[PDB]
Amino acid sequence: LSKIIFRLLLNVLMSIIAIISYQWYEQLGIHLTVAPFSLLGIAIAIFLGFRNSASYSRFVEARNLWGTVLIAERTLVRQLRNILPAEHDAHRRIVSYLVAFSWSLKHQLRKTDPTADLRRLLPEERVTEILASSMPTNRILLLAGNEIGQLREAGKLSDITYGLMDNKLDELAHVLGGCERLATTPVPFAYTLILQRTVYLFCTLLPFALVGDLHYMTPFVSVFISYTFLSWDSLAEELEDPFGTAANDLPLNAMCNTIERNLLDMTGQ
Amino acid sequence: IIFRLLLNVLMSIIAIISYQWYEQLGIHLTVAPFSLLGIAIAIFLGFRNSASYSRFVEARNLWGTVLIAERTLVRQLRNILPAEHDAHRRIVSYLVAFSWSLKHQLRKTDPTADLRRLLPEERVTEILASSMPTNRILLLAGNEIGQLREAGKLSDITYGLMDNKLDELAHVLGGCERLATTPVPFAYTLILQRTVYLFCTLLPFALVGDLHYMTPFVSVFISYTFLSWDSLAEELEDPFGTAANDLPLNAMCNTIERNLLDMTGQHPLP
Amino acid sequence: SKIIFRLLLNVLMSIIAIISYQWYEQLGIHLTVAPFSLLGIAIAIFLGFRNSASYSRFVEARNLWGTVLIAERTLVRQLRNILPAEHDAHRRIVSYLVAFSWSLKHQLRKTDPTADLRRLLPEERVTEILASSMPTNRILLLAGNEIGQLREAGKLSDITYGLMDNKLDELAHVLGGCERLATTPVPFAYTLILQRTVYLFCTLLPFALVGDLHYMTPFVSVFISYTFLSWDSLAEELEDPFGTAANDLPLNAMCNTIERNLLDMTGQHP
Amino acid sequence: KIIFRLLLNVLMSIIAIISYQWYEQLGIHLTVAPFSLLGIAIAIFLGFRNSASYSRFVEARNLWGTVLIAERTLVRQLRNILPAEHDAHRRIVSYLVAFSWSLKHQLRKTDPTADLRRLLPEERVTEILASSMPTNRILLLAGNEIGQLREAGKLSDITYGLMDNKLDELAHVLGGCERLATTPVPFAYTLILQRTVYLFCTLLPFALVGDLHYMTPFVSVFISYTFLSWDSLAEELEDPFGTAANDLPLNAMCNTIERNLLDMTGQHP
Amino acid sequence: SKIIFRLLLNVLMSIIAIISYQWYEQLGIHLTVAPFSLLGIAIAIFLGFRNSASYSRFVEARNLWGTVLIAERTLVRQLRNILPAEHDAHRRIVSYLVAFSWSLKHQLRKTDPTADLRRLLPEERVTEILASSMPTNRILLLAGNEIGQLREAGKLSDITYGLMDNKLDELAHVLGGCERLATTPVPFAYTLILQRTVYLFCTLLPFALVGDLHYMTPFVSVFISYTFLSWDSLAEELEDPFGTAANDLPLNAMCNTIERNLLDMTGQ
Ligand SMILES: [Cl-]
Ligand SMILES: [Cl-]
Ligand SMILES: [Cl-]
Ligand SMILES: [Cl-]
Ligand SMILES: [Cl-]
Ligand SMILES: [Cl-]
Ligand SMILES: [Cl-]
Ligand SMILES: [Cl-]
Ligand SMILES: [Cl-]
Ligand SMILES: [Cl-]
Ligand SMILES: [Cl-]
Ligand SMILES: [Zn+2]
Ligand SMILES: [Zn+2]
Ligand SMILES: [Zn+2]
Ligand SMILES: [Zn+2]
Ligand SMILES: [Zn+2]
Ligand SMILES: [Zn+2]
Ligand SMILES: [Zn+2]
Ligand SMILES: [Zn+2]
Ligand SMILES: [Zn+2]
Ligand SMILES: [Zn+2]
Ligand SMILES: [Zn+2]
Ligand SMILES: [Zn+2]
Ligand SMILES: [Zn+2]
Ligand SMILES: [Zn+2]
Ligand SMILES: [Zn+2]
Ligand SMILES: [Zn+2]
């Protein structure tokens, strides 16, 4: 959403400032060779490399977690069918909580209003309990645990099979903490701070130190070099907001729709 | 690939004969800045190829679980219900149908022939109705295990032992689906394959000042190295890609089918 | 940061450089950059791996604290779901769990737990806990006795007792995981052979730079020492993630979250 | 092996100093800076490649380590749960030992028949040898032992399950070894790397010679040793079930296993 | 920590190199710094990756020992919460658990466990244990039948016997993992290749540096040699985590911590 074709052509210009500036240079006692900029440029590419690595890892973890939502809810619906196929009332109740959980987890991470979706899926008295909590999504898990918890007290599930389905609720519980953790723990600011400073300074001092060698090609190369360090420093911030609505963020709404369609395929609806 | 090895050799033959009208005008290309650019690109290609490898390893691992989980499920059926061969046959069908259906799912090819060969056509049209056929095959396998439980042939404990194996497959389905809907860079593997593509053709212009008539040779050696590394990343990054090698995906569904018929003594021929 | 002493100090070492330059010719000291390129790149490579190792320690520490919140959340869920009427047990257990995480934060910060312990538990138990040389483990054992009594009371079966037992196991893994990241630091050689060689590289770098950039030398030398020394000290910050630096973990915020969570509505559930 | 390519390189370096006579007379000139670029690139790729090979080696050693652990504790549970069934003890142990040797034979593409025959009845050997996967069949037979103890009421479903889990663990080891064996990366890793490390090594002296003159062969083999030795160790580590120097001592590993399992069931090697 | 002899050899190497620089032209030897950039950078990359593998072995060792303290703690917590009356079996099992960790320590350090073993066990069992070529495994087998006895004595259900069996399984994986780290060392070719090339690089380096640094090379080259050599030997001080240096795992401390923890959880 924020772009830097601004600094690629501030480069083209601060490259042109350089060529005309050349002949008043050694006058002052100012020369700039590339060798120390090779040193720094390489030290920055190493550090850009490790950083982007962290950024990609955390994006992959965000996708893994949403992946698990689809898996655990798929299999918990399957277990309900295979263990209690008479029980379509309980089927339909548990399914609306599991769908509610995903929608509510999307809203929570986008900081939007789950109320419409919650009301689409759940009794109004259930919606009230969920929204009264300071942790609505976690309160949805508690309610689904009640559905199977009473199926247990009613003897329709044993402690064994109660256990098989509880574990899926633990899986979702790990997804929720995981998303909360990812959403409140960015890659430390120092990294992107330090890097965005040095990648910036280096990208505009570069056409200076390149002028002695390349003279009047300083722009077509000091740009090429700068774009490379910038399309690589940008791929970073394009990968550390996984839950947003931007283009390269995760399509959470589409994944929530896939989760809902999946569970309704499994229950006829 | 080798079309861009020869776009290079001629970009360099261009570079030598045109080198004459170069600093007639003041247009200098050292090799020191192009070595800072190259080392940087080579560093990023290192990390990029490192992430592709990991996607490739995870796909191989997920397919490994299919073989593992299906084998231990069938071993459990035999060990716990050694008499129930009709159930053995039915379940072994769905497991085999799951593997093939998954492979067809990932490579976006038609599963109908493999399903029609494995399953009763009532279940085949049910499976082909679902927008999630592989999931529906797992669901059907589950009803088999559940019926043995309703019938009292499986206890809740032993029903549970087999349920776990179906979970393992559930994880494999989603893992594979996640690994396919991606990439995660979007079109930034777009930008880096052209950043390499540009560098590799600007390069002989920068080298000609140092090597004259030999720059077609040293700049194609370098280009091959960079484009080989890059293209290797392209291949690893899309492990179920249409432009992939189906040998192991095919070999894997064939191994598991073979193993399973063996385990249910449908081999050898009497 | 605390860098700005040395980033300053470097500009005056880079000054001593330029007011003893042409004085080089007389004294016999040639001093090129390409050896300091080599030395610089090796230090960058080694700083790259050091910093990677430190982030891993940060990330694992953050995950361990994530699990406290997860495991404690789902343990209260199980109690609310299996023994829904047992509010005296719910509140007793919730208090130990909140005791557990505050007690852990004090343990890793080497501060006194007694305030928080008393805010939350009976003082007979506040003294049982401080009596133990391992108080967080003692809190775990107490939470296990509540779980265990409910089982001798016949309110939990063996199955449902195990279900809750496993969550206390999960927290025993957080405890040991944190003790390992605390009591096992990174080896000390890694920390100060590496920080002497980076500043030593920083205070000599201009003496070899002064020949190529003349006056420009304090600029580029300080640019380069910034890049190097900010990277090194970020590494030493994340290496100690239970510490109190600006990039360490917010352990107090995280214990409040756990607390607000388990006591969501004075502890009221549907 | 590697010292033949080292030898061919010092010869290539002599061909270089000799034919330096006719260099610009034949219209050539080769600087070092281009080869430092190419050379650092190859170093970086070799560094990552090598890292991947070591990972495979550690995973292969890991999987074998789990055979020992799982088999140890399966025997531990038989003794703790059924202290009286010494015949089950000896039959399961002979399968668990049969499993290990067969796994070795499998991964080494050799014949298990001797070892099988040493350890089991011939009616079993024939059943095992009939299988597309003998190790699978051995796991299934070990599974019958504990499964028959369960039909006899000597094992509950719970305690049958506990031991079944260990057989499940051996299944995973088998799968993982089978996956580490039938999954070499596309030779692209070897062809791109091995031939370009070869090719770079042999043209390095032609580019070193203008700078170093008679010193060419000394520095040119030092650089060539470093790269080749690095590349060649990568190739040993990536096939860890082979018979090379750095390859898992699978026979000793099997004897340690048999030694262990015989030691736990009161017998003497 | 006799890197310092290697660096003083390096100062002599550049003394020799400055002294010898005259007869360079005469003898026809040309040494630029550029091919040594290439080689040194390559060595750095490989040293970086190698050192990284060494760190990862050290960390796996510490995690393995971390699991001992965790698994033994929660086994004892389970015994107290499930069988709070049976303090006779608590003490039996705790002494088997504490025996395991001391026996593991001595096993990895190739020392005599008899002192700690007889300090904790009746000789009725200590001689059984040391008659085995796998003592620590046998201590696990012995802890196992304590649990098994309780089960067959009806005091444990299959379910609760199961719950504790899983913790013995955890200790089994620690045993296997530690043994695996001890017997399977990091491939020795790593330290050969690298000790050679790093040492040879550090001595050949002044002969390439003096062309352009003249009387300064003793300094610049001892620096570089200090960086490489000390990085390389950090990797080696990390590759044997079960050793004896203060650099290594304080296994005695960890075993004392484990003993105190399990004794404290029982009163003693
Ligand atoms: Cl699942
Ligand atoms: Cl329904
Ligand atoms: Cl499995
Ligand atoms: Cl059959
Ligand atoms: Cl059969
Ligand atoms: Cl949990
Ligand atoms: Cl195990
Ligand atoms: Cl026996
Ligand atoms: Cl545990
Ligand atoms: Cl006691
Ligand atoms: Cl006690
Ligand atoms: Zn799952
Ligand atoms: Zn239904
Ligand atoms: Zn966004
Ligand atoms: Zn059958
Ligand atoms: Zn067959
Ligand atoms: Zn959990
Ligand atoms: Zn309550
Ligand atoms: Zn000058
Ligand atoms: Zn000057
Ligand atoms: Zn295990
Ligand atoms: Zn026996
Ligand atoms: Zn499994
Ligand atoms: Zn555990
Ligand atoms: Zn006691
Ligand atoms: Zn007594
Ligand atoms: Zn002795």
CB contact under 8 A, E70 and C176: yes
Contacting residues of E for C172, CB less than 8 Å apart: 70, 73-74, 77
- End-to-end CA separation in angstroms for chain C: 50
Nearest 5°: phi and psi at E96?
-65, -40
B132 and A265 within 8 Å at the Cβ level: the answer is yes
C-E CB pairs within 8 A amount to 147
CA dihedral of B49, B52, B56, B61, whole degrees rounded to 10 = 110
Contact by Cβ (8 Å): C82, C262: no
Q: What is the DSSP string of chain B?
A: -HHHHHHHHHHHHHHHHHHTTSTTS-B---SHHHHHHHHHHHHHHHHHHHHHHHHHHHHHHHHHHHHHHHHHHHHHHHHH-TT-HHHHHHHHHHHHHHHHHHHHHHHT---HHHHHHHS-HHHHHHHHHSS-HHHHHHHHHHHHHHHHHHTTSS-HHHHHHHHHHHHHHHHHHHHHHHHHH--SSSTTHHHHHHHHHHHHHHHHHHHHHHHGGGHHHHHHHHHHHHHHHHHHHHHHH-TT-TTS--HHHHHHHHHHHHHHHHHTT--S--
* Sequential DSSP letters for chain C: -TTHHHHHHHHHHHHHHHTTSTHHHHHT----SHHHHHHHHHHHHHHHHHHHHHHHHHHHHHHHHHHHHHHHHHHHHHHHHHSTT-HHHHHHHHHHHHHHHHHHHHHHHT---HHHHHHHS-HHHHHHHHHSSSHHHHHHHHHHHHHHHHHHTTSS-HHHHHHHHHHHHHHHHHHHHHHHHHHS---HHHHHHHHHHHHHHHHHHHHHHHHHHBTTHHHHHHHHHHHHHHHHHHHHHHTSTTS-STTS--HHHHHHHHHHHHTTTSS---
Question: Residue E21 burial (CB < 10 Å; 0-12/13-18/19+)?
Answer: middle
The residue count for chain A: 269
d(CA D194, CA B32): 27
Say how far apart CA A67 and CA A51 lie, in whole Å: 25
Q: Which of A202, A213, A211 is nearest to A21 (CA)?
A: A211
DSSP-derived 3-state class of residue D218: helix
User: Smallest Cβ distance to E30: which of D215, D225, D263?
Assistant: D215
Q: Which residues of C168-205 are buried (b: 16+ CB within 10 A; e: fewer)?
A: bbbbbbbbbbbbbbbebebbebbbebbbebbbebbbbb
CA distance A199 to A234: 11
In whole angstroms, give the CA distance from residue B222 to residue B200: 8
Residue A248 to residue B186, Cβ atoms within 8 A: yes
> What are B27's strand-pairing partners?
A215
Residues 6+ apart with CB under 8 A from A192: A51, A236, A237, A240
Q: Residues with Cβ within 5 Å of ion ligand 10?
A: E 87, 90, 266
Distance in angstroms (rounded) separating the CA atoms of residues A155 and C254: 39
- Cα angle, residue E212 at apex, residues E210 and E215 outer, rounded to 5°: 50
For residue A172 the two structure tokens come to 């979702």
Whether C234 sits inside 8 A of A188 (CB atoms) is yes
Residue type present at position E50 = R
Contact E199, E205 (CB under 8 A): no
Coil, helix or strand at residue A250 = coil
How far is residue B139's CA from residue B144's CA, in Å, rounded to a whole number?
9
Residue given tokens 């009976």 in the structure block: C122
CA dist E86 and C62 (Å) reads 39
How large is the angle between the packed helices D134-151 and D157-181, nearest 10 degrees?
A: 180
d(C-alpha B179, C-alpha B59), whole Å = 7
Instruction: Tell me if E74 sits within 8 A of E93, measured CB to CB.
Output: no
- Report how far residue E148's alpha carbon sits from residue D85's, in angstroms, rounded to the nearest whole number: 14
Structure method = X-ray
**Is the CB of residue C152 less than 8 Å from the CB of residue A152?**
no
Find the angle CA(A68)-CA(B143)-CA(B61) to the nearest 5 degrees.
Answer: 40
Residues of E within 8 A of C143 (CB-CB) are none
Cβ contact (<8 Å) for B160 and A158? no
Partners of residue A29 in chain C, C-beta under 8 Å:
214-216
Discontinuities in chain B (C→N > 2.5 Å), after residue: none
Place of tokens 């190698």: E50
Touching A: C residues 40-69, CB under 8 Å: 40-41, 44-45, 47-48, 51-52, 55, 58, 62-63, 66-67, 69
For D80, the token pair is 């703790």
A63 Cα: distance to centroid of ligand 1 (angstroms): 17
**Chains in contact with chain D (at least 3 beta-carbon pairs closer than 8 A):** B, E
Ion ligand 13 neighbours, Cβ < 5 Å: A 88, 91
Which of E50, E64, E77, E151 lies closest to E104 in space, CA to CA?
E64
From E134, which residue of chain D is nearest by alpha-carbon distance?
D260
Rg (CA), chain D: 27
- β-bridge mates for residue C214, sequence order: A30
E172 touches chain C (CB under 8 A): no
Cα distances (Å, whole numbers) of residue C159 to A160, B145, C90, C151, C156: 7, 22, 19, 10, 8
D141 CB-side CA count, 13 A: 25
A88-110 and A35-83 helices cross at what angle (nearest 10)? 160
Quote the DSSP letter at residue A186.
Answer: P
Distance CA B258, CA B71 (A): 11
Contacting residues for D94 by C-beta, under 8 A, at least 6 apart: D119, D120
Residue C213's nearest CA partner among B57, A35, D112, B135 is: A35
Check residue A215 and give left, alpha or beta (phi > 0: left; psi -120 to 50: alpha).
Answer: left
Give backbone dihedrals phi and psi of C75, rounded to 5 degrees, phi first.
-65, -50
Q: Do A77 and A98 form a contact (C-beta atoms < 8 A)?
A: yes
DSSP letters for D138-205: HHHHHHHHHHHHHHTTSS-HHHHHHHHHHHHHHHHHHHHHHHHHS-PPPTHHHIIIIIHHHHHHHHHH
The dihedral region occupied by D31, where left means phi > 0, alpha psi between -120 and 50, and beta the remainder, is beta
CA dist D193 and B46 (Å) reads 13
**C-alpha pair distances (Å), C242 with each of C248, C249, E58, E64, E118:** 6, 6, 21, 22, 40
Give this entry's resolution in angstroms. 2.8
Which pair of tokens denotes residue E200?
């040879």
* CA distances from residue B258 to B67, B262, D107, D124 in whole angstroms, order as listed: 11, 6, 19, 20
Neighbours of ion ligand 16 (CB under 5 A): B 258, 262, 267; D 132
Give C151's contacts in chain E (Cβ within 8 Å).
81-82
Chains touching C (at least 3 CB pairs under 8 A) are A, E
Question: Cα separation of E14 and E19, whole Å?
Answer: 8
Q: Given CB atoms, is E39 within the 8 Å cutoff of chain C?
A: no
